[PDB]
Ligand binder design. Structure first.
Ligand code: SF4
Ligand SMILES: [Zn+2]
Length: 888
């Protein structure tokens, strides 16, 4: 039985069937001092207590958080729901389909593979910026999206009918996290007579954005999301919780982008890897939900697991503003107050006992950008001309392009649209208002529109060759932009709506005009992309921009007008208004009270109702797609998009006792913070690449290749794209090249091809890496890929959260150097042969010895963090375990 059933009571005498687990009735004083994020974990456990998967001791361990956060103990977490996007959605539905096949083959019931909790899939990663600057670019971009992606869309639509509790938001709707904030989020579930907190895991590293609204949720890899969808609790070490105290008032010209950029730099310097961040202080109450979500969004960019903003009165008002039903609205607040998860940020006696406390004074926040190559390299707007000019002559790296001093004023004239332009170092060639990070915030969006209005009024313009775009996260933004009369002014400056999806933010930035590309490559120019996203690593925005800066939407427009980032806005005018002479950025920048006025009068409940009323049925191309009535998928042999994966090939019911890895070669010797885009690229498939050869052999031409993202349903392509990033720094070669050495023969080969040589001779493989291995995106192909390449272990100094879990879920051992030890300190060259002794009895985070062919040995920490993770390893992976659990 549930040993906590005596806690269940009516929330309201008048609607008596609707109960909740009243946590205050624990009569435990520890509860009221808990961080609010831990309180949600506590509720999830209490409601789910059965004594098999969620035990009574687990509840006691969570209540005792204050002590047990230091005892490295594991706790179950069952989230209320799952959210997916299309890039991770396809491979997730392919593995569900493959699990059905596998269950059936063991004589089980294929119907047991079905989501038991609600799952939402938003299709937002497919559309690209092919056309811009016109009223018709939206239709033309959506048309192209459908033509390119028809087969994957047919497969996803199939999935939504073949699996229970799968809702699809079709293409053209918006971006996963924005749609989540505005529409999908419940905040409080009302389910089978029970109220409980909304909480979630998403297959996207930025799922943390929902934490701004007070829903506990974070990114997991696809295989973890599948386990969760099948009823399996996440197993996690009980986290420490950093309290982040916000104080004072931000300056009236400060955007929420300035704040998040400041917080990123700061939290990256405190180091919060493996930890929860909870916000509190007087400052939080002044921040709108949109502002909170922006801070919570960039959570993976500063390394925290979650960035939680407890539900308060600002949250309630956001729910009424976005047109949540008044029926729901009554019990949402009333429940949170009764259970003790309703916050008052202006009450210091309500503050939890945090692990420790880091502060930020909001008046110290200045207008700023991040770049040119990392999200944490925050640079003030006042200092942008000086910083970029320093970057020009500086040693190549995160803050250098080392262009020779005599070449600092290189430029190239070009002809676009029959007129002559000049391009120089620092010239803006992409100016994109993208990203759910900022388009969910009417303050920066209307701020940008009012800046545009005042700029057109002052006679300013954006030169026609600049790739300017607006990619809103929902139809709601287009609606209020038009309603406020601000849209025609954004149109004029080249910021017509180009589509609803990730687009520039994820790297789907489209082509640049050919004369512009020839100017950049001819004069070796450092061309600049300015964007309102959260990621600016030197691969990911556009192949032709060497510098990319994160900036608030109004700054995006300002730099587009300027045409360059080599400007000192306070000293040099943007243009001359014939009449009233010189016009500075100061003169056209709107304050937070002109914006707030426009926001109160145009961002209204009726607008959200109309946009989301028809959300699922409005797409006529989607509605028209034919899908089979099948419950088991008919794998088409002709398909280059959907392929039955090899993972569960020859799966047995009985467990295999895991063997030592004997004499492995090092396939790759990698450095610090190798990202999941290096391990598993999502964009362009290069002409000289193994994936390109596989595709050419199936009759495809380069323009049909599509992205690596779109092919995540085809393991053959995805394996060939593993470590296929053109900027991969393999320390075997000491240059940027997606290649390695096949050590027995000495030949340099593309990484897939070297792996195949090793595999065919039956040789096991490992990877060596430095700090923060696997940073960024959540893609589980960063673990499946290496698994199919024959990689049995990784040895790194540290791992990022999601990636480590994905390695474990694929049966790869994540090994870690003992603190103070690494490849240089142990004298590893990467040329030795590695034996990893896996003992008969395993323990979380145990030390194992590593023997070398040279006779040398050392120790590494085996990074299975909990007992259930050890079980996943014993089973050869998380899904193999789930198949077995379902089969019997
Ligand atoms: S790629 Fe950008 S726009 Fe898309 S979900 Fe991620 S953060 Fe949001
Ligand atoms: Zn010249």
């Amino acid at each position: 039985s549930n040993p906590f059933a005596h806690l269940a009571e009516p929330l309201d005498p008048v609607q008596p069937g609707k109960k909740f687990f009243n946590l205050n009735k624990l009569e435990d004083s520890r509860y009221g001092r808990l961080p609010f994020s831990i309180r949600v974990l506590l509720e999830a456990a209490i409601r789910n207590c059965d004594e098999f998967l969620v035990k009574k001791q687990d509840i006691e361990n969570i209540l005792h958080w204050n002590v047990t956060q230091h005892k490295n103990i594991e706790v179950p977490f069952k989230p209320a729901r799952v959210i997916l996007q299309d890039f991770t959605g396809v491979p997730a539905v392919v593995d569900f389909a493959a699990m059905r096949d596998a269950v059936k083959k063991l004589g089980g019931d294929p119907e047991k593979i079905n989501p038991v909790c609600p799952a939402d899939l938003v299709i937002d990663h497919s559309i690209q910026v092919d056309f811009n600057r016109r009223a018709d670019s939206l239709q033309k971009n959506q048309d192209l999206e459908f033509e390119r992606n028809r087969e994957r869309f047919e497969f996803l639509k199939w999935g939504s009918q073949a699996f229970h509790n799968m809702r699809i938001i079709p293409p053209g709707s918006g971006i996963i996290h924005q749609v989540n904030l505005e529409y999908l989020a419940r905040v409080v579930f009302d389910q089978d007579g029970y109220y409980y907190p909304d909480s979630l895991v998403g297959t996207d590293s930025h799922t943390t954005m929902i934490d701004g609204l007070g829903i506990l949720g974070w990114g997991v890899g696809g295989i973890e999301a599948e386990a969760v969808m099948l009823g399996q609790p996440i197993s996690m070490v009980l986290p420490q919780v950093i309290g982040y105290r916000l104080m004072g008032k931000p300056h009236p010209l400060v955007t929420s982008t300035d704040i998040v950029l400041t917080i990123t730099k700061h939290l990256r310097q405190v180091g919060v890897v493996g930890k929860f961040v909870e916000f509190f202080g007087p400052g939080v109450a002044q921040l709108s939900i949109a502002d909170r979500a922006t801070i919570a969004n960039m959570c993976p960019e500063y390394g925290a697991t979650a960035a939680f903003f407890p539900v308060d009165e600002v949250s309630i008002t956001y729910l009424v503003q976005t047109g949540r039903d008044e029926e729901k609205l009554k019990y949402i607040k009333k429940y949170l107050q009764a259970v003790g998860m309703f916050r008052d940020f202006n009450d210091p006696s309500q503050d939890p006992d945090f692990t420790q406390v880091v502060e930020l004074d909001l008046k110290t926040v200045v207008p700023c950008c991040s770049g040119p190559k990392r999200p944490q390299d925050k640079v003030a707007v006042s200092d942008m001309k000086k910083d970029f000019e320093s970057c020009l002559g500086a040693k190549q790296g995160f803050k250098g392009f080392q262009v020779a001093p005599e070449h600092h004023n290189d430029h190239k004239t070009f002809i676009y649209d029959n007129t002559e332009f000049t391009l120089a170092h620092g010239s803006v060639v992409i100016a994109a208002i993208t990203s759910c990070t900022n388009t969910s915030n009417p303050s920066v969006m209307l701020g940008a529109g009012l800046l545009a209005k005042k700029a057109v009024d002052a006679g300013l313009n954006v030169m026609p060759y600049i790739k300017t775009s607006l990619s809103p996260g929902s139809g709601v933004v287009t609606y209020y932009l038009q309603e406020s009369g601000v849209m025609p002014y954004l149109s004029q400056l080249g910021f017509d709506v180009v589509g609803y999806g990730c687009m520039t933010c994820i790297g789907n930035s489209g082509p640049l005009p050919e004369p512009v590309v020839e100017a950049i490559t001819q004069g070796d120019l450092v061309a600049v992309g300015v964007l309102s996203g959260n990621r600016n690593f030197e691969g990911r925005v556009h192949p032709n921009t060497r510098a990319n800066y994160l900036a608030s939407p109004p700054l995006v427009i300002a730099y587009a007008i300027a045409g360059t980032i080599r400007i000192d806005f306070e000293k040099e005018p943007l243009g001359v208004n014939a009449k009233g002479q010189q016009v500075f950025l100061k003169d056209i920048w709107p304050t937070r009270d002109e914006i707030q006025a426009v926001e109160r009068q145009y961002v209204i409940p009726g607008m959200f109702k109309e946009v989301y009323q028809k959300i699922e049925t409005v797409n006529e191309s989607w509605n028209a797609l034919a899908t089979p009535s099948d419950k088991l998928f008919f794998w088409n042999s002709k398909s280059t998009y959907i392929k039955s994966p090899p993972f569960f090939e020859n799966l047995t019911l009985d467990l295999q006792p895991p063997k030592s890895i004997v004499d492995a070669y090092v396939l790759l010797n990698l450095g610090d913070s190798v990202t999941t885009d290096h391990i598993s690229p999502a964009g362009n498939i290069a002409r000289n690449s193994p994936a390109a050869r596989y595709l050419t052999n199936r009759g495809l031409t380069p323009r049909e290749f599509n992205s690596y993202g779109s092919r995540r349903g085809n393991d053959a392509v995805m394996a060939r794209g593993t470590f296929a990033n053109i900027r991969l720094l393999n320390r075997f070669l000491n240059k940027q090249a997606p290649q390695t050495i096949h050590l027995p023969s000495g030949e340099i080969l593309d990484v897939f091809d070297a792996a195949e040589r090793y595999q065919q001779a039956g040789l096991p493989l490992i990877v060596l890496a430095g700090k923060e291995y696997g940073a960024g995106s959540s893609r589980d192909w960063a673990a499946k890929g290496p698994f199919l390449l024959g990689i049995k272990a990784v040895l790194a100094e540290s791992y990022e959260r999601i990636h480590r879990s994905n390695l474990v879920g694929m049966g790869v051992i994540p090994l870690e150097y003992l603190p103070g030890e690494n490849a240089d300190a142990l004298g590893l060259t990467g040329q030795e042969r590695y034996t990893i002794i896996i003992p008969e009895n395993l323990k979380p985070q145990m030390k194992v010895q590593v023997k070398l062919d040279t006779g040398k040995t050392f120790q590494a920490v085996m990074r299975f963090d909990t007992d259930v993770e050890l079980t996943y390893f014993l089973n050869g992976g998380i899904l193999n375990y789930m198949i077995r659990k379902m089969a019997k």
